[PDB]
Design a protein around this motif. Structure first.
Motif, PDB file in Angstrom:
ATOM      1  N   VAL A 211       6.240   7.160   1.022  1.00 27.56           N
ATOM      2  CA  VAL A 211       6.165   6.059   1.992  1.00 27.56           C
ATOM      3  C   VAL A 211       5.194   4.946   1.506  1.00 27.56           C
ATOM      4  CG1 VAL A 211       6.024   5.367   4.442  1.00 27.56           C
ATOM      5  CG2 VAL A 211       6.702   7.708   3.861  1.00 27.56           C
TER       6      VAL A 211
ATOM      7  N   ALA B 203       8.133  10.848  14.199  1.00 30.28           N
ATOM      8  CA  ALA B 203       8.555  10.404  12.866  1.00 30.28           C
ATOM      9  C   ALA B 203       8.911  11.598  12.005  1.00 30.28           C
ATOM     10  CB  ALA B 203       7.481   9.553  12.204  1.00 30.28           C
ATOM     11  N   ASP B 204       9.410  11.341  10.787  1.00 33.93           N
ATOM     12  CA  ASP B 204       9.858  12.282   9.755  1.00 33.93           C
ATOM     13  C   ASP B 204      10.847  13.348  10.292  1.00 33.93           C
ATOM     14  OD1 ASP B 204      10.186  13.427   7.193  1.00 33.93           O
ATOM     15  OD2 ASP B 204       8.039  13.203   6.710  1.00 33.93           O
TER      16      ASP B 204
ATOM     17  N   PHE C 246      11.965   1.562   7.556  1.00 38.41           N
ATOM     18  CA  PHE C 246      11.621   1.913   8.940  1.00 38.41           C
ATOM     19  C   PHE C 246      10.673   0.869   9.533  1.00 38.41           C
ATOM     20  CE2 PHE C 246      12.981   6.429   9.041  1.00 38.41           C
ATOM     21  CZ  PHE C 246      12.920   6.838   7.727  1.00 38.41           C
ATOM     22  N   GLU C 247      10.454   0.935  10.865  1.00 34.76           N
ATOM     23  CA  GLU C 247       9.452   0.118  11.542  1.00 34.76           C
ATOM     24  C   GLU C 247       8.062   0.625  11.037  1.00 34.76           C
ATOM     25  OE1 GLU C 247       8.340   0.987  15.798  1.00 34.76           O
ATOM     26  OE2 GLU C 247      10.037   2.383  15.850  1.00 34.76           O
TER      27      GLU C 247
ATOM     28  N   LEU D 169       3.267   9.082  14.937  1.00 32.38           N
ATOM     29  CA  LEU D 169       2.751   7.746  14.653  1.00 32.38           C
ATOM     30  C   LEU D 169       2.456   6.885  15.884  1.00 32.38           C
ATOM     31  CD1 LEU D 169       5.167   7.066  11.754  1.00 32.38           C
ATOM     32  CD2 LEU D 169       2.976   8.157  11.665  1.00 32.38           C
TER      33      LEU D 169
ATOM     34  N   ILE E 120       1.426   4.716   1.618  1.00 32.15           N
ATOM     35  CA  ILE E 120       1.089   5.371   2.885  1.00 32.15           C
ATOM     36  C   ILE E 120       0.937   6.909   2.737  1.00 32.15           C
ATOM     37  CG2 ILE E 120       1.800   5.760   5.278  1.00 32.15           C
ATOM     38  CD1 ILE E 120       3.111   2.957   5.276  1.00 32.15           C
ATOM     39  N   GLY E 121       1.782   7.546   1.928  1.00 28.17           N
ATOM     40  CA  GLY E 121       1.766   8.988   1.709  1.00 28.17           C
ATOM     41  C   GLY E 121       3.081   9.527   1.185  1.00 28.17           C
ATOM     42  N   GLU E 122       3.319  10.853   1.346  1.00 28.17           N
ATOM     43  CA  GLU E 122       4.563  11.481   0.873  1.00 28.17           C
ATOM     44  C   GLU E 122       5.514  11.898   1.998  1.00 28.17           C
ATOM     45  OE1 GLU E 122       3.242  11.828  -3.548  1.00 28.17           O
ATOM     46  OE2 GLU E 122       2.368  11.180  -1.635  1.00 28.17           O
TER      47      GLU E 122
ATOM     48  N   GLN F 142       0.403  14.597  11.626  1.00 30.75           N
ATOM     49  CA  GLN F 142       0.732  13.651  10.543  1.00 30.75           C
ATOM     50  C   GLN F 142       2.133  12.970  10.735  1.00 30.75           C
ATOM     51  OE1 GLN F 142       1.695  14.816   6.440  1.00 30.75           O
ATOM     52  NE2 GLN F 142      -0.045  13.613   5.687  1.00 30.75           N
TER      53      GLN F 142
ATOM     54  N   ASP G 162      -1.478   7.219  12.158  1.00 29.51           N
ATOM     55  CA  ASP G 162      -0.875   8.533  12.458  1.00 29.51           C
ATOM     56  C   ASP G 162      -1.841   9.345  13.298  1.00 29.51           C
ATOM     57  OD1 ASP G 162      -2.116  10.708  10.502  1.00 29.51           O
ATOM     58  OD2 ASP G 162      -1.434   9.138   9.099  1.00 29.51           O
TER      59      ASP G 162
ATOM     60  N   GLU H 104       0.846  -1.189   0.000  1.00 28.87           N
ATOM     61  CA  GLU H 104       0.000   0.000   0.000  1.00 28.87           C
ATOM     62  C   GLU H 104       0.883   1.240   0.000  1.00 28.87           C
ATOM     63  OE1 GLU H 104      -2.748   2.532   2.550  1.00 28.87           O
ATOM     64  OE2 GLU H 104      -3.074   0.513   3.379  1.00 28.87           O
TER      65      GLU H 104
ATOM     66  N   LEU I 243       4.139   1.531  11.573  1.00 23.51           N
ATOM     67  CA  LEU I 243       3.221   1.897  12.662  1.00 23.51           C
ATOM     68  C   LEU I 243       1.831   1.973  12.070  1.00 23.51           C
ATOM     69  CD1 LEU I 243       6.029   3.612  14.107  1.00 23.51           C
ATOM     70  CD2 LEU I 243       4.303   3.215  15.862  1.00 23.51           C
TER      71      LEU I 243
ATOM     72  N   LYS J  38      -4.894  11.121  11.512  1.00 22.44           N
ATOM     73  CA  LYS J  38      -6.015  10.228  11.182  1.00 22.44           C
ATOM     74  C   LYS J  38      -6.854   9.857  12.442  1.00 22.44           C
ATOM     75  CE  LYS J  38      -5.229   9.332   6.579  1.00 22.44           C
ATOM     76  NZ  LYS J  38      -4.424   8.202   6.046  1.00 22.44           N
TER      77      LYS J  38
HETATM   78  C1  LIG Z   1       8.621   6.217   9.301  1.00 23.34           C
HETATM   79  C2  LIG Z   1       7.704   5.794   8.206  1.00 23.34           C
HETATM   80  C3  LIG Z   1       6.339   5.362   8.687  1.00 23.34           C
HETATM   81  C4  LIG Z   1       6.012   4.252   9.477  1.00 23.34           C
HETATM   82  N1  LIG Z   1       4.713   4.155   9.719  1.00 23.34           N
HETATM   83  N2  LIG Z   1       4.165   5.243   9.075  1.00 23.34           N
HETATM   84  C5  LIG Z   1       2.856   5.654   9.041  1.00 23.34           C
HETATM   85  N3  LIG Z   1       1.947   4.833   9.631  1.00 23.34           N
HETATM   86  C6  LIG Z   1       0.531   5.106   9.716  1.00 23.34           C
HETATM   87  C7  LIG Z   1      -0.238   4.431   8.643  1.00 23.34           C
HETATM   88  C8  LIG Z   1       0.142   3.293   8.048  1.00 23.34           C
HETATM   89  C9  LIG Z   1      -0.578   2.753   6.953  1.00 23.34           C
HETATM   90  C10 LIG Z   1      -1.666   3.387   6.468  1.00 23.34           C
HETATM   91  N4  LIG Z   1      -2.112   4.555   6.972  1.00 23.34           N
HETATM   92  O1  LIG Z   1      -2.114   5.565   5.962  1.00 23.34           O
HETATM   93  C11 LIG Z   1      -1.494   5.129   8.177  1.00 23.34           C
HETATM   94  C12 LIG Z   1       2.559   6.847   8.409  1.00 23.34           C
HETATM   95  C13 LIG Z   1       3.597   7.597   7.798  1.00 23.34           C
HETATM   96  N5  LIG Z   1       3.427   8.861   7.254  1.00 23.34           N
HETATM   97  C14 LIG Z   1       2.113   9.523   7.317  1.00 23.34           C
HETATM   98  C15 LIG Z   1       1.699  10.040   5.950  1.00 23.34           C
HETATM   99  C16 LIG Z   1       2.809  10.873   5.318  1.00 23.34           C
HETATM  100  C17 LIG Z   1       4.124  10.094   5.242  1.00 23.34           C
HETATM  101  C18 LIG Z   1       4.550   9.576   6.611  1.00 23.34           C
HETATM  102  C19 LIG Z   1       5.162  10.687   7.470  1.00 23.34           C
HETATM  103  C20 LIG Z   1       5.714  10.235   8.804  1.00 23.34           C
HETATM  104  O2  LIG Z   1       6.921   9.490   8.648  1.00 23.34           O
HETATM  105  N6  LIG Z   1       4.842   7.144   7.803  1.00 23.34           N
HETATM  106  C21 LIG Z   1       5.126   5.996   8.443  1.00 23.34           C
END
Ligand SMILES: CCc1cnn2c(NCc3ccc[n+](O)c3)cc(N3CCCC[C@H]3CCO)nc12
Lengths: 298, 270
Positions: free
Chosen positions: A19, A145-146, A81-82, A135, A11-13, A132, A87, A9, A84, A90
């Motif tokens: 991601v 995160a980020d 990364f691990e 996590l 996840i986003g940008e 956002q 967020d 899937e 999660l 959400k």
């Molecule tokens: C370190 C990377 C990471 C690990 N988990 N995770 C999640 N997990 C939540 C999740 C997972 C699956 C589906 N839904 O959408 C929520 C979100 C996310 N991010 C939020 C969106 C923009 C990118 C990114 C920013 C923050 O690293 N990045 C990550």
């Protein structure tokens, strides 16, 4: 090079890259991959990537995301990364009608203030604390995160990038163009996320740099040289700014108790030098239940 | 523990994380004892060349020291390196350093142009990934100049112990820096921690007492380093200290933080 991972899937940008949720074909282990397209990059590996990797490979704490590995596929650089499950943006949205239980707010804030105290002691400024980027897992944990917009600071600090925090969570010292900024900028962001968890609405949802300041000024009261020694002298300060009075925190954050309102107030102090610290905030009566102090030597 | 009482964290915790980091960032004075075709004066000429490009491009003393740390640490991972590879390794170490430390770093072409065609943006872009992968992405060290920054701040601190707002004289900073720049050219400096090297240069401009107050180290900790720096200190003292340069587009509150260049090799010969 990514032969054992299966993208599941998008996840986003985020700050940089894209991601994807991926699965370790043999292990069954689920990760989050941040993919960077080097083929497109004129300056090679972005400074944002180089910073995130080197900063996080030195930041091991339970309330900070774990960078598992970095893989290069002679066109792309992947940060593994691990994963999660959700967020904080959400989660607050899903809870907008319900409300987050106050004990869960207190838990989240405490763990958030621990990840920050660790960052700050390791001399790292997050500079992008927004929901956002926070996590959560199924077990009750929240992690920073980020670290794409983060930077390691000197002792003493020097002038850093101005165009630095997400507008709604931006500290007045950044907005009013102070040359130096530090740890206090992250506490401001946390102060905002705290009230937003309580009220389920952004504390200061400005549409411009000027509106952001005015929204802050309307709530916390227009600052002066007594509340903030140095304002009137600061670059973007205009003596023509409307003069507002600080609103009662009972109206600003009604579900929050006297101890909750005190912490929020010190977290949102105009003066960076007076604004509470992550470590100090851990010792506030608002958490005196969730934490018991430890003996102090010397 | 020379840091005053800290608001954001435990001053002992902060200082010990800083100290423990020098233990996780290893550097060896016998790295060219892995590269037999290479001579210690080659490192010196490259390090000198990078200081010049830094001044030309108005880069920070910090980004120059990041490139030096990257170079000396990348070599300890390599086996056989030819004299010709050096321009590439140096400028790529500087390319990574500039991106990490600067707000508006020079572009890839600006780094290629300054090699006069000997290095293309593509080799810099490849080398950058070899250096970074080989350093195992450990690119956050406490550089030699990073320590002098700390030390200089602790010297100029009042009853309002504001440890992060910079308050110290620029001319004194430059004069201590110049000595460190001169010792960085000799590959023997790597036998001494970066914290120790900085303290010892500060000592040659002050006293044991100020040194201990700002750095924490006892005289015994610094004794062998001061002993080694002794010639370098005199070569500088014999010549007379330099003056705080101005740089166009660079605010004067930060002019002391801009990397500069001199006849450092002629002085090094002594
Ligand atoms: C370190 C990377 C990471 C690990 N988990 N995770 C999640 N997990 C939540 C999740 C997972 C699956 C589906 N839904 O959408 C929520 C979100 C996310 N991010 C939020 C969106 C923009 C990118 C990114 C920013 C923050 O690293 N990045 C990550």
């Amino acid at each position: 090079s990514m032969e054992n991972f299966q993208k599941v899937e998008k996840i986003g940008e985020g700050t940089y890259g894209v991601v994807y949720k991926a699965r370790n074909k043999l292990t069954g282990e689920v990760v989050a991959l941040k993919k960077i397209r080097l083929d497109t990059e004129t300056e090679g590996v972005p400074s944002t990537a180089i910073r995130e990797i080197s900063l996080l490979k030195e930041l091991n704490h339970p309330n900070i995301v774990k960078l598992l590995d970095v893989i290069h596929t002679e066109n792309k650089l992947y940060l593994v990364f691990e994963f999660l499950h959700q967020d904080l943006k959400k989660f607050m949205d899903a809870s907008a009608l319900t409300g987050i239980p106050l004990p869960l707010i207190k838990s989240y804030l405490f763990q958030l203030l621990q990840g920050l105290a660790f960052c700050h002691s390791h001399r790292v400024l997050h500079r992008d604390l927004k929901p956002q980027n926070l996590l959560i897992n199924t077990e009750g944990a929240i992690k920073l995160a980020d670290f794409g917009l983060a930077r390691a600071f000197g002792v003493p600090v020097r002038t850093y990038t101005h165009e630095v925090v997400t507008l709604w969570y931006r500290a007045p010292e950044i907005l009013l163009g102070c040359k130096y900024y530090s740890t206090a900028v992250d506490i401001w962001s946390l102060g905002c996320i705290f009230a937003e968890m309580v009220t389920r609405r952004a504390l200061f949802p400005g549409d411009s740099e000027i509106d952001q300041l005015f929204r802050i000024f309307r709530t916390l009261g227009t600052p002066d040289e007594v509340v903030w020694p140095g304002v009137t002298s600061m670059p973007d300060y205009k003596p023509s700014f409307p003069k507002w009075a600080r609103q009662d925190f009972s109206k600003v954050v009604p579900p929050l108790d006297e101890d909750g309102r005190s912490l929020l107030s010190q977290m949102l102090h105009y003066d960076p030098n007076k604004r509470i610290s992550a470590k100090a905030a851990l010792a506030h009566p608002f958490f005196q239940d969730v934490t018991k102090p430890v003996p102090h030597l010397r | 523990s020379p840091l005053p009482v800290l608001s954001w964290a435990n001053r002992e915790e902060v200082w010990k994380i800083m100290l423990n980091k020098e233990k996780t960032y290893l550097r060896d004075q016998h790295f060219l004892e892995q590269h037999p075709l290479l001579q210690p004066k080659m490192r010196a000429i490259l390090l000198d060349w990078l200081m010049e490009v830094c001044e030309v491009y108005k880069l920070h003393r910090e980004t120059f020291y990041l490139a030096q740390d990257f170079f000396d640490r990348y070599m300890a991972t390599q086996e056989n390196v030819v004299k010709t590879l050096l321009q590439l390794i140096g400028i790529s170490s500087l390319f990574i350093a500039a991106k990490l430390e600067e707000i508006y770093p020079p572009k890839l072409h600006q780094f290629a142009y300054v090699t006069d065609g000997a290095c293309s943006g593509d080799e810099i872009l490849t080398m950058e990934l070899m250096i970074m992968k080989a350093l195992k992405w450990r690119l956050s060290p406490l550089t030699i100049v990073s320590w002098l920054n700390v030390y200089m701040q602790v010297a100029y601190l009042n009853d309002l112990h504001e440890v992060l707002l910079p308050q110290y004289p620029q001319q004194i900073f430059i004069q201590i820096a110049e000595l460190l720049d001169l010792c960085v050219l000799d590959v023997d400096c790597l036998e001494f921690p970066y914290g120790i090297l900085a303290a010892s240069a500060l000592y040659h401009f002050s006293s044991s007492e100020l040194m201990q107050k700002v750095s924490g180290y006892q005289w015994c900790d610094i004794e062998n380093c001061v002993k080694w720096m002794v010639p370098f200190a005199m070569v500088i003292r014999e010549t007379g200290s330099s003056k705080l340069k101005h740089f166009r587009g660079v605010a004067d509150e930060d002019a002391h933080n801009i990397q500069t260049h001199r006849d450092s090799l002629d002085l090094l010969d002594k």
